[PDB]
Amino acid sequence: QDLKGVWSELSKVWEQIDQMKEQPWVSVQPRKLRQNLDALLNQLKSFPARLRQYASYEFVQRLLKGYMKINMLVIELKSEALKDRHWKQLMKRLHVNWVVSELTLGQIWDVDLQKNEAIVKDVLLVAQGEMALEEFLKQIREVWNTYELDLVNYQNKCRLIRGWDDLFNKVKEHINSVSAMKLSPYYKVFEEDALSWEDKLNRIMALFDVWIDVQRRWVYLEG
Amino acid sequence: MTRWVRGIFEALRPLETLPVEGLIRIWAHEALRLFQDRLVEDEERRWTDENIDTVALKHFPNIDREKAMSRPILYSNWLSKDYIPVDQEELRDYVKARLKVFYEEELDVPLVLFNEVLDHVLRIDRIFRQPQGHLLLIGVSGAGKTTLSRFVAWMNGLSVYQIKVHRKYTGEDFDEDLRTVLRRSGCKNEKIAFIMDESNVLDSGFLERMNTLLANGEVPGLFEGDEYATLMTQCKEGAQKEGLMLDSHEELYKWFTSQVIRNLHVVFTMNPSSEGLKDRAATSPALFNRCVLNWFGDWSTEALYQVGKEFTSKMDLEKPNYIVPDYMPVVYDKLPQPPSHREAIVNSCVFVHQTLHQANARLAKRGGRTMAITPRHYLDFINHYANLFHEKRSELEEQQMHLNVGLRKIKETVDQVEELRRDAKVNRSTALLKSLSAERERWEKTSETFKNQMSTIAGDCLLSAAFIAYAGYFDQQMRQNLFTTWSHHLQQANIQFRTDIARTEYLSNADERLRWQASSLPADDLCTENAIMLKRFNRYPLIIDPSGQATEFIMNEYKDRKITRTSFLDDAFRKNLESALRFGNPLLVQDVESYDPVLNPVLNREVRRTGGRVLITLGDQDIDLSPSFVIFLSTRDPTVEFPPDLCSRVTFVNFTVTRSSLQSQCLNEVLKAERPDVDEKRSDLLKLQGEFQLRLRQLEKSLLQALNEVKGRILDDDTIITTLENLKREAAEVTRKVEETDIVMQEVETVSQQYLPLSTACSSIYFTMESLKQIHFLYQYSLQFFLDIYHNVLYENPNLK
Numbered sequence A: 001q002d003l004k005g006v007w008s009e010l011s012k013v014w015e016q017i018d019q020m021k022e023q024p025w026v027s028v029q030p031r032k033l034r035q036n037l038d039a040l041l042n043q044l045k046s047f048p049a050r051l052r053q054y055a056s057y058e059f060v061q062r063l064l065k066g067y068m069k070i071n072m073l074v075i076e077l078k079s080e081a082l083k084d085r086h087w088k089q090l091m092k093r094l095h096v097n098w099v100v101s102e103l104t105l106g107q108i109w110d111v112d113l114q115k116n117e118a119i120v121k122d123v124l125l126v127a128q129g130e131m132a133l134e135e136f137l138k139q140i141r142e143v144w145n146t147y148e149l150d151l152v153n154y155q156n157k158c159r160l161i162r163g164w165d166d167l168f169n170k171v172k173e174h175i176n177s178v179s180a181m182k183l184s185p186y187y188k189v190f191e192e193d194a195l196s197w198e199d200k201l202n203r204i205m206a207l208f209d210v211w212i213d214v215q216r217r218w219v220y221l222e223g
Numbered sequence B: 001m002t003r004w005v006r007g008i009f010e011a012l013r014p015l016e017t018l019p020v021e022g023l024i025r026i027w028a029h030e031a032l033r034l035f036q037d038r039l040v041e042d043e044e045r046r047w048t049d050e051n052i053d054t055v056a057l058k059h060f061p062n063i064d065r066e067k068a069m070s071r072p073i074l075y076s077n078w079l080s081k082d083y084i085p086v087d088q089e090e091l092r093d094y095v096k097a098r099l100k101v102f103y104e105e106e107l108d109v110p111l112v113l114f115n116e117v118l119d120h121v122l123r124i125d126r127i128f129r130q131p132q133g134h135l136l137l138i139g140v141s142g143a144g145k146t147t148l149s150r151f152v153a154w155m156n157g158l159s160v161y162q163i164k165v166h167r168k169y170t171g172e173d174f175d176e177d178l179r180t181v182l183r184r185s186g187c188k189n190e191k192i193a194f195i196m197d198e199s200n201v202l203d204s205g206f207l208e209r210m211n212t213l214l215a216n217g218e219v220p221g222l223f224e225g226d227e228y229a230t231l232m233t234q235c236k237e238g239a240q241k242e243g244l245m246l247d248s249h250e251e252l253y254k255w256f257t258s259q260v261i262r263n264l265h266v267v268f269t270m271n272p273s274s275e276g277l278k279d280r281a282a283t284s285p286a287l288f289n290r291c292v293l294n295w296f297g298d299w300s301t302e303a304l305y306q307v308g309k310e311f312t313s314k315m316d317l318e319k320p321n322y323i324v325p326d327y328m329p330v331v332y333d334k335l336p337q338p339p340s341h342r343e344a345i346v347n348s349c350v351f352v353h354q355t356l357h358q359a360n361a362r363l364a365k366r367g368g369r370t371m372a373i374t375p376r377h378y379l380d381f382i383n384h385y386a387n388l389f390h391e392k393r394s395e396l397e398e399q400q401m402h403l404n405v406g407l408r409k410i411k412e413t414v415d416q417v418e419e420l421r422r423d424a425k426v427n428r429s430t431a432l433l434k435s436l437s438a439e440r441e442r443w444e445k446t447s448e449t450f451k452n453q454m455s456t457i458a459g460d461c462l463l464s465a466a467f468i469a470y471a472g473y474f475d476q477q478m479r480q481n482l483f484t485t486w487s488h489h490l491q492q493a494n495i496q497f498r499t500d501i502a503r504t505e506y507l508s509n510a511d512e513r514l515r516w517q518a519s520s521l522p523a524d525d526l527c528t529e530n531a532i533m534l535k536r537f538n539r540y541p542l543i544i545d546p547s548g549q550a551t552e553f554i555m556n557e558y559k560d561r562k563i564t565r566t567s568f569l570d571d572a573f574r575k576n577l578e579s580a581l582r583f584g585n586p587l588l589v590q591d592v593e594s595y596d597p598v599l600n601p602v603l604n605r606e607v608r609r610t611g612g613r614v615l616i617t618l619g620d621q622d623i624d625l626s627p628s629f630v631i632f633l634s635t636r637d638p639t640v641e642f643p644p645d646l647c648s649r650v651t652f653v654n655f656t657v658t659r660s661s662l663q664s665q666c667l668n669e670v671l672k673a674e675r676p677d678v679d680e681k682r683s684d685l686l687k688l689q690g691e692f693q694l695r696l697r698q699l700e701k702s703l704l705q706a707l708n709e710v711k712g713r714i715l716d717d718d719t720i721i722t723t724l725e726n727l728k729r730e731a732a733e734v735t736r737k738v739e740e741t742d743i744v745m746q747e748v749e750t751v752s753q754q755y756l757p758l759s760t761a762c763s764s765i766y767f768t769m770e771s772l773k774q775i776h777f778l779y780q781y782s783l784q785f786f787l788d789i790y791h792n793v794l795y796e797n798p799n800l801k
């Protein structure tokens, strides 16, 4: 009858839901997931109103509606700033036990993202801050592992060094930034690296401050 | 006229059979797209529009002018092909679909499709589909120049590329940027949308190279030496890809020139300025000869109405009890008759925008200093309206839920006390029952008041948003005039709002004001209103103050959030910026008159969320962004004029004392130090708008919390009714205050009117002392000085004893 038909349609919809929930979270594409959700919306709306008035159909429709409204939650979560420390921390807060290698969208969809929006957004903001700090560390590493002295010949007797101003400004910028790292409580991650960079930058500052004086005095006395 | 003939020929080439009506239609379309395109005001636009049909009919009689010209003249190849004329609605649907696809692709911010925006999109699309189709836009900031240019470029497959300017932006950086864009365009056969604003155009050094690039099709001499050899090597590869093997350097160089001309469209976005545009013409003729002109300024009333209608879909604003007023105040001529509440409120918003145009024009006529008003201010105003409406509705709903929960708890407790009475104590129990019933009636009355506030919320929110977003630059008197005009307009439309609404009270509470007063903030009304503006903002505020109290106040307010100081003039400005934007702390900035255009991405709030990382592009360097970043721009000079581009990206907070602000301050001081009873009655009147209500709600919440601990022990002496007697006497006091508010406002007005002349004299004396500097450089006096005389007069005066 009509009840049997709507039960069969519900079983088909649930099977499709299970099928795409079997996709591991590593291999899930948020845009394709949203497109599949919209396709299910179109398929469900194609059902007759008599089948649409059933309570189970309404429950599945509102569950999918929750899924689309948390699709942007998933998109934010499907970043690279999460690392794994933030994921473990939100495991601890949510008191759920999953496997990173075996992680799929199904378990996270079972967890009420809407009920835990505040915690999820806080974790996302924490991850963004930590990723920003680590990205600045990467940037400083790449700019100091590639910086070269602008050597230039001098009277064919030696090869002096110029560009003091730009190098001093760069070092001052970096040392001010690393000094400012101590605040912004997200600094409680990656501490020894920041201290090592600060120490090496202070060494560079002292060495080159002595070096410029030595150079000017030597060139004056040479003349 | 040769471009006229070229366009007509291009339109006629795909087609083979046309009646005279089609030919005249194409002629008129090209006339519209070439002549009236560059027109500025409306009068000459209508002149050109009528003279086109005059000429067409005079030189072509015996033709049906209805089909020959239609008022919505439009041509495109998007519907079908072959540049067939299309109707407005079909192309509107097509552009809606394509803009939806764009939304899923980039620029999630919504767009509203009125007639002007669609016409501009069509014009830009026509210009792009042309060899050496360079384009120049002249229109007020925020009218949709860069946005529409980017949208049309993307829809054509034209990859956008814009240069980010900053301080010490040397000509060599611009040369490198041109080398990069030329390599991307000509060598790789990748079409480029090269979109320049006016900030980087200010320097004439780049303008000469841009002039040569526009005119010749490519600047000679941008590639020289080793980079020239790399260009030749990559051009060999490019010619290999096209199967056009060429060996000699000049031959493949001119092929590269042809590729650049075919695959490079430059779009310029200039803020309209007669002297600025004249200077631009002086330094370059290509911006008017080789560059076609498109003008579109302030949004029309239709555009503003549709933008408001689309941006006000989400909040309810359905009031079924709304009655259409007789003589509806209408600024939109296509307003539905009879209109519902939503049409009325959006029309009121459009009226607010238009009346601020009128007020700015009047103030310019008076000879004062005017800040430009742009549609970005309108969008910020609608965002403030939506945010405040959602917040206030949520607060009222939560308060109603709390009242319902309290009522249910009271019902349970009455049932429990009846059961405990079932078993001198009985007299106390009966007294408790009667007191609880009276408190229930008070609950019902408070529910009625809640319904009244729910009725008022829409108009109250509209006025609050209009004040907080639009105003702020004007003085206290002008702010009051604008607020009174808006209130009068809302009264005309029968939009429910409290007639005695106070801006300071409605948009804050007690603890925020106490915190502000803890920091170096005077109790002046202008200071309180501008602190309100400083608390809530979508665009980062610009603070102007001749006194400097603003910097100290905002330093103290954000001291716990490691806020720091930085001015534009120093060389540490860029590094302080980068620090603030990356580590997530506020950055108060001073001396804004020497504005650095590098802040444009920051003010625009245009961020890119890609690869698990939000990036804000400062100059040529991509910088990560922290959510806890608020930036404040400040200046000490109060008479400096700002470019409208900056004027349209920040909200103005004004602290300059004026003849009305100082008069109000002195009058308030007189009331405080001379008639303390009148001052405290005025303070009670001000606090009646919620503060007394909030204290009553908090006290009854405490009563509910205490009643939760019942366990039969509430009948220790069978009279816990002392707390509810305290509540009852407090409610009686506040009810008396509400009932007699009319006599209170009357007596406050009388006393203020009596004490007004002293305040006026104080203002005149202080401004004379301030103006004493023109007689002699020696005669310099400060506001604090006049305040010292004022206190020596009010207090420690032997004569008054």
Ligand SMILES: Nc1ncnc2c1ncn2[C@@H]1O[C@H](COP(=O)(O)OP(=O)(O)O)[C@@H](O)[C@H]1O
Binding pocket: B109, B110, B111, B112, B113, B114, B117, B140, B141, B142, B143, B144, B145, B146, B147, B148, B197, B269, B307, B376, B379
């Ligand atoms: N039709 C529209 N509907 C909604 N918002 C719009 C519309 N046109 C423009 N906007 C908004 O106004 C802004 C226009 O900026 P734009 O004028 O391109 O900057 P510029 O003045 O630097 O060229 C955009 O941020 C966009 O969000």
